[PDB]
From Swiss-Prot, chain A:
Keyword DNA-binding found: no
GO BP, one annotated term: translation
Keyword line: Mitochondrion, Ribonucleoprotein, Ribosomal protein
Localisation per UniProt entry: Mitochondrion
Entry keyword annotation includes Cytoplasm: no
Gene Ontology CC: mitochondrion; ribonucleoprotein complex; ribosome
Similarity comment: Belongs to the bacterial ribosomal protein bL33 family.
Name of the molecule in the record: Large ribosomal subunit protein bL33m
Described function: Component of the mitochondrial ribosome (mitoribosome), a dedicated translation machinery responsible for the synthesis of mitochondrial genome-encoded proteins, including at least some of the essential transmembrane subunits of the mitochondrial respiratory chain. The mitoribosomes are attached to the mitochondrial inner membrane and translation products are cotranslationally integrated into the membrane.
Subunit composition and interactions: Component of the mitochondrial large ribosomal subunit (mt-LSU). Mature N.crassa 74S mitochondrial ribosomes consist of a small (37S) and a large (54S) subunit. The 37S small subunit contains a 16S ribosomal RNA (16S mt-rRNA) and 32 different proteins. The 54S large subunit contains a 23S rRNA (23S mt-rRNA) and 42 different proteins. bL33m stabilizes the tRNA acceptor stem in the E-site.
GO MF entry, a single one: structural constituent of ribosome
UniProtKB/Swiss-Prot annotation, chain B:
Stated name of the protein: Large ribosomal subunit protein mL38
Record localization: Mitochondrion
Superkingdom as given in the UniProt entry: Eukaryota
Intrachain S-S bonds: none
Coiled coil: none
From Swiss-Prot, chain C:
Intracellular or extracellular location(s): Mitochondrion
Region (Disordered): 1-26
Its job: Component of the mitochondrial ribosome (mitoribosome), a dedicated translation machinery responsible for the synthesis of mitochondrial genome-encoded proteins, including at least some of the essential transmembrane subunits of the mitochondrial respiratory chain. The mitoribosomes are attached to the mitochondrial inner membrane and translation products are cotranslationally integrated into the membrane.
Family the entry assigns: Belongs to the universal ribosomal protein uL15 family.
Oligomer status and interactors: Component of the mitochondrial large ribosomal subunit (mt-LSU). Mature N.crassa 74S mitochondrial ribosomes consist of a small (37S) and a large (54S) subunit. The 37S small subunit contains a 16S ribosomal RNA (16S mt-rRNA) and 32 different proteins. The 54S large subunit contains a 23S rRNA (23S mt-rRNA) and 42 different proteins.
Biased composition (Gly residues): 7-19
Full-length numbering of the shown residues: 64 to 125 of 312
Name of the protein this chain belongs to: Large ribosomal subunit protein uL15m
Length: 48, 112, 62
RNA sequence: CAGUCGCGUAAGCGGGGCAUAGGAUCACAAGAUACAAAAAGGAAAGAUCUUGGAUUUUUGGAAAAGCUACGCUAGGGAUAA
RNA sequence: AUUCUAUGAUUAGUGUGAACGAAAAUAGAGCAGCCUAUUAAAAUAAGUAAAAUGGCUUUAAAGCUGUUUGAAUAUUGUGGG
C-alpha cells in the first residue's frame, strides 16, 4: 500500500515499457531509457 | 589493439654506433628485445611516447601498397568448452522422454 | 521368468516386489510423483499445435 | 557478441545496492509479436515475448469445526491400563 | 438413407486436474427405394422456426426443454446448416 508499481511508457509510441517501484508520497518517475524497438535512448514517462 | 612504443635512448659520450653494426643487429631477429638491444650498445632510455593502432577500414589498402603480408588472416577468440563429462539427464520428466512412455508424453513434452 | 515358483528360481516368495509396500499390495498411478507438482504444472505447456498446417512430402534433387 | 548510452585526460568501469534475510502454474489484466484463423473474407477464442495484482505464510502452492463411555473395519503393538 | 464391426482415435477437442472423447473418410457385413409408399398416409405443414430466461446435452454451434414472447414463402436466391 505504501509502495506502488508504476509503468514507464516510451515516448516514441513504440509500446515498450519499464516497470519500477516508488512510494505513493513522491513525484512521478521520468527517465532516459533504451527503447529496443527503435534501438535508441528515448524519454520514458510514467503511465498515468 | 597493437601498442607502438616510441623510445628515445641516449648514447654515452663519444660512443658512435657503427653504421654497419646497427643494420646487422636486426638481421635474423624477429623478436626485437629492447632489453637486450640496450645492453649491447650501452644506451640509456631518456624519453618515450605511445600510440596504439588496431584494425580499421584503411588497414587492408595500406598493406597492399607496401606488400605487408597477412591481410587475409582473421583471429577468433579461443573457446574453452566445459571439462565435465557428459552425464545422463535426471528428473521424472527426463527419464520418461523415450517412445517407451508414449502414454505419459503429455506430462513430459512441450514444457515451458 | 515365471515368478512365484520356488526360492531357487530366484523369483520365489516376494516375486521381485520387495516387502509390504504400495508397490507390493496395489498399483501406483504412473503420473504420480509422490505429491510434488510436475514441471508441466509448475512451468505449463508451451505453445500450440498447428492443426491447419499442410503436411508436405519432402523431395530433394539429390 | 550485437545494439547504444553515462562517467573519465586516459586506462577503462557500468546488465543496481559490501556480502549473507521477497514463491511457480492456472485464471485475470495492460502492452508488444503477425504465428494460426474449423467453407471463404474478417473476428472471437488461442500462441510467443514483457509486465502487474498473492500472510498462494501448511511459502514445490486444499476454499474446511468438534463428539462418540454405544462406536465399526483394516492394522501396528513406536508402551499405551 | 438407416443399422452392425474395425480403423481413423491414449486424435481434434473439453477439463484446474483425474480423466472424458467426436466427425469426415476408409474397409467388411448387408444393400432398396419411395408418396400409385404393395396396403392404403401430405391438398408440403405457425403458437411452428426462433428470441429472452431456467435447465439438459455439449466445445461457445447444432440438438432437447418449462416460463414469457414470436417469423418468412423457392436458385428470378424465401427458409435451415
Ligand atoms: K523382472
Ligand atoms: K508379506
Ligand atoms: K488434447
Ligand atoms: K443452442
Ligand atoms: Mg534372491
Ligand atoms: Mg522389482
Ligand atoms: Mg517397496
Ligand atoms: Mg500439497
Ligand atoms: Mg473463416
Ligand atoms: Mg465457420
Ligand atoms: Mg510444503
Ligand atoms: Mg526448497
Ligand atoms: Mg520398539
Ligand atoms: Mg468408431
Ligand atoms: Mg417443408
Ligand atoms: Mg427450438
Ligand atoms: Mg447459427
Ligand atoms: Mg435450428
Amino acid at each position: 500500500s505504501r509502495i506502488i508499481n508504476v509503468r514507464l511508457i516510451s515516448m516514441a509510441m513504440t509500446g515498450y515499457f519499464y516497470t519500477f517501484t516508488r512510494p505513493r508520497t513522491s513525484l512521478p518517475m521520468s527517465m532516459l531509457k533504451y527503447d529496443p524497438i527503435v534501438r535508441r535512448k528515448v524519454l520514458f514517462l510514467e503511465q498515468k | 589493439y597493437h601498442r607502438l612504443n616510441v623510445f628515445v635512448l641516449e648514447q654515452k659520450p663519444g660512443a658512435k654506433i657503427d653504421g654497419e653494426a646497427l643494420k646487422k643487429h636486426l638481421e635474423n631477429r624477429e623478436n626485437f628485445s629492447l632489453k637486450g638491444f640496450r645492453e649491447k650498445f650501452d644506451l640509456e632510455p631518456v624519453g618515450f611516447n605511445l600510440f596504439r593502432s588496431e584494425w580499421d577500414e584503411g588497414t587492408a589498402e595500406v598493406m597492399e601498397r607496401h606488400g605487408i603480408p597477412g591481410a587475409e588472416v582473421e583471429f577468433k577468440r579461443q573457446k574453452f568448452a566445459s571439462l565435465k563429462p557428459p552425464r545422463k539427464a535426471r528428473g521424472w520428466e527426463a527419464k520418461r522422454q523415450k517412445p517407451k512412455y508414449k502414454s505419459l508424453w503429455k506430462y513430459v513434452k512441450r514444457i515451458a | 521368468i515365471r515368478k512365484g515358483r520356488g526360492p531357487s528360481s530366484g523369483y520365489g516368495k516376494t516375486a521381485g516386489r520387495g516387502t509390504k509396500g504400495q508397490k507390493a499390495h496395489g498399483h501406483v498411478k504412473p503420473w504420480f510423483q509422490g505429491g510434488q507438482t510436475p514441471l508441466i504444472v509448475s512451468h505449463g505447456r508451451k505453445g500450440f499445435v498447428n492443426q491447419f498446417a499442410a503436411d508436405m512430402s519432402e523431395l530433394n534433387l539429390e
